[model samples]
Target: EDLPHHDEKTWNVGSSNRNKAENLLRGKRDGTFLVRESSKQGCYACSVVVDGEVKHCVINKTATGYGFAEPYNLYSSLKELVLHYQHTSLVQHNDSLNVTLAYPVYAQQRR
Candidate 1:
C-alpha cells in the first residue's frame, strides 16, 4: 500500500497515543499517575492510576506501549508537560457530594 511521505502525513499514531494519555491525565486529576523516564531517550514509563489500581504503559513521541525501563529526564519532562496545563473544577450536587472534574477552562467557556 502506498503511504504519504513523512512531511505530508497529517496524522500520526504516536500523536494519537499521546492524546490518549494526556486525556486520561486531564480527566482524572483527582487520581494520580506516575511517570518515569525510560532507558531510551525521549521515552517514558507512565503508570496511570485507574479504578484504585495502577496501570503501566510507555510514552514517547514515536510510540506508547506497555513496557518498563529503569525510569530516568523524560519522566520529569513529560510529567511537567502534563501537569503544566492541568486544571480542575469542583461541582457540588444536591446530595451534598462534590465531584471534581478536569477540563480546560477555555473548552468549558466555548460550550
Candidate 2:
C-alpha cells in the first residue's frame, strides 16, 4: 500500500517548528518516512524507516487531557522521534557533535 500524506491542519505547531520537524526526516534505501494525522483527535501517526523497514508510532493527548503527548519510552513527539533516530544513525557512524546535539535528555533519563 502507498503511504499517506498529511493535510496542512494536521500540524498544529508554528511554521518554524513545522519546518524544523520536517527537516529531520531522512529516507533510507527503498524506505520513506511519513507523518500524518491519526483518526484520533489531536493525534498524529508517524511512520519511520529503520533497518529498511517502517515502524509506526503515535503522538496524542496526555493521559490527563491537559497537554500534548510527551516523549516517553515507546512514544515520542515527531521532533523527538526524528532526533532519536538521527542521533542513533550518527552515533553508529561516530559523528560526535551532531549526535550530541540530537540526543534528547528525556531519552537519556528514560534509559
Candidate 3:
C-alpha cells in the first residue's frame, strides 16, 4: 500500500485560508489530524495526505466571540501552521494554540 495525499476544503473558509490550512496538512504527511469549527457558518477544517491518498479530516471552530474577528488573524494562524510544517514536519491541527510533537524528523536529503 502507498501513503495518502491529503487535501481539505470548507465553504466558510476562503481559498487563502485553505492554503494556510495546507501548511498543517503538509507537515503531517505521515500522521493524521482532526478538523472542527465553532460556528456552522464560519468554520475551519484540516486534512492530511499520505503518499497520494487522503487520510485525516478534522473540523474545529470557536464561539461567536472566540473565533477570528478578522480574516488576517486566521491567515496568520495558518501561516504558523505552515511554518511548523516546514521546520518540524508535524502538526496538531485542532490544537493550534499549542502544537506539540512526539519525535521530529530532521534528515536532510539531497536531490
Candidate 4:
C-alpha cells in the first residue's frame, strides 16, 4: 500500500464546554450500550497522525452501532471509540458494557 507522507499539523477534537468535553473523553454508559460522544464540531481542528506525522482527522457525527441515534452527545466519546474499534475487529461479547480501553488513543498518530 502506498501511503502519503505525514503532514505537520496536529488535530484536536474538543468542546469549549468543560462538562461536555470531559463527558466524551471519559464516556457515558447506558443499559443498552456504551457510547463516547463528541463535544466539538468540524474537521478543521482535528487531525490524524502516522509515524509522528499528521495524516488526517475529520470530526463528524459518525454512526456507532450502540443502538443509538445521538452518539455524539459528548458523554459517549470514549465508549464510541471502543465500540468502533471493536466492531472493526468483528468481536462480540456480553460483558463489554463495563470494559474500557487500557490505552485510549483517539486522534493520536505514531511511527
Candidate 5:
C-alpha cells in the first residue's frame, strides 16, 4: 500500500458520532483507540478507552500536519502520529489518562 499504515479498522472509522465511538470502545481493553470523522471536515476525532472511561478528542489536522493538541508538535500524517504514541506512554502528555495507544481497533469486514 502507498500509505504506511493501511489499516482502516484502526484509523478512519468513518463519519460517526460519540455514541457509535463509545460503543466501539465499550468493554475494549485500556489504551485501545478508534479514529472517526470529526465535526469539521479534514479534522478527525479519537475515542480512546482510558481506564473505564472513554476519552474523546479531536485530532486537529492543520496546514502544517496532524497533532492531538495545538501546543504539541505535528506529525506528517495521522497514521504517523498514532504510531509514535503506540509505543510511548500517553502520560507524557497527561497523567490522568496514563495509557498508550496500544490497540487500534480494526473493525470487522465482510468476505
Candidate 6:
C-alpha cells in the first residue's frame, strides 16, 4: 500500500472520502458523476448529481468484475461501466434515478 496515493488521483478516489466526492460534484450540472471508495470496504460508490440532487450508488465488485445491483449488472471494467452509462440511463425502472454519467469532474485533467 506504499503507492503514490496523492500523485495518482488521475481521478480515481480510492479512499472512502464521500465528503470530498460530494464537493467535487457540487455546483456542477445534472449528469455529473465520480466513482469513490465506499464508507464500508471492498466496494465502490457512484456519486452523481441528478435533477439538482446528489445521489450515491453502491457499485459492488466481484472476483471476476464490477457491477451495480445485487443480482448485479456486470461490466468487464470500470471504464467500460462508466463509459456505457454516460450515454445510457441509470435505469428505466426509476424515473428519478434515470440520469446519465455525462460529466466527469476530473476527466479533463486541467493543467
Off-target runs (Cα >4 Å) in candidate 6 are 1-11, 69-73, 91-93
Q: Is candidate 1 or candidate 2 better by lDDT?
A: 2
RMSD of each: 14.9, 13.6, 11.8, 15.6, 3.7, 6.2
The whole-model lDDT of each prediction reads 0.35, 0.36, 0.37, 0.29, 0.67, 0.66
Local accuracy of candidate 4 as per-residue lDDT tens digits, 1-111: 421111121112343233443443443231111122234432222222122222222234445423323445342453454344333321122322233222223323444
Q: How much lDDT does candidate 1 score?
A: 0.35
Q: Highest lDDT among the candidates is held by which one?
A: 5
| C-alpha RMSD between model 1 and the true structure | 14.9
Model 2 residue 95 distance off true place after TM-score fit, in angstroms: 23
lDDT per residue for candidate 6 within 73-106, as digits (tens), equals: 5577676667676877875625667688876766
> What would the TM-score be for candidate 3 when compared with the true structure?
0.29
Off by over 4 Å in 3: 1-40, 59-76, 90-111
In Å, residue 75's CA in model 3 sits off its true spot by: 12
**Residue runs of model 5 more than 4 Å from their true location after superposition:** 1-5, 68-73, 107-111
Q: Alpha-carbon error at 53 in model 1, in Å?
A: 2.9
Ranking by lDDT: 5, 6, 3, 2, 1, 4
Error at 3, model 6, angstroms: 26
* Tens-digit lDDT track of model 2 for 1-111: 311112222222232233344443343321334455544356655444344333443544465432223354443344544544443432232232122222221221221
Clashes of each: 0, 0, 24, 9, 1, 0
TM-score of 2: 0.32
Q: Write the per-residue lDDT of candidate 3 for residues 1-111, one digit (tens) a residue.
A: 311112222212234334554664566545334343423356454444544444334333454333223455442354344334334443343333233221122211111
lDDT measured at residue 43 in model 2 versus the true structure, 0 to 100: 62
Q: How well does each candidate superpose onto the true structure, as a TM-score?
A: 0.29, 0.32, 0.29, 0.23, 0.75, 0.72
Tens digits of per-residue lDDT for model 1 on 66-93? 2321244232343234443132211221
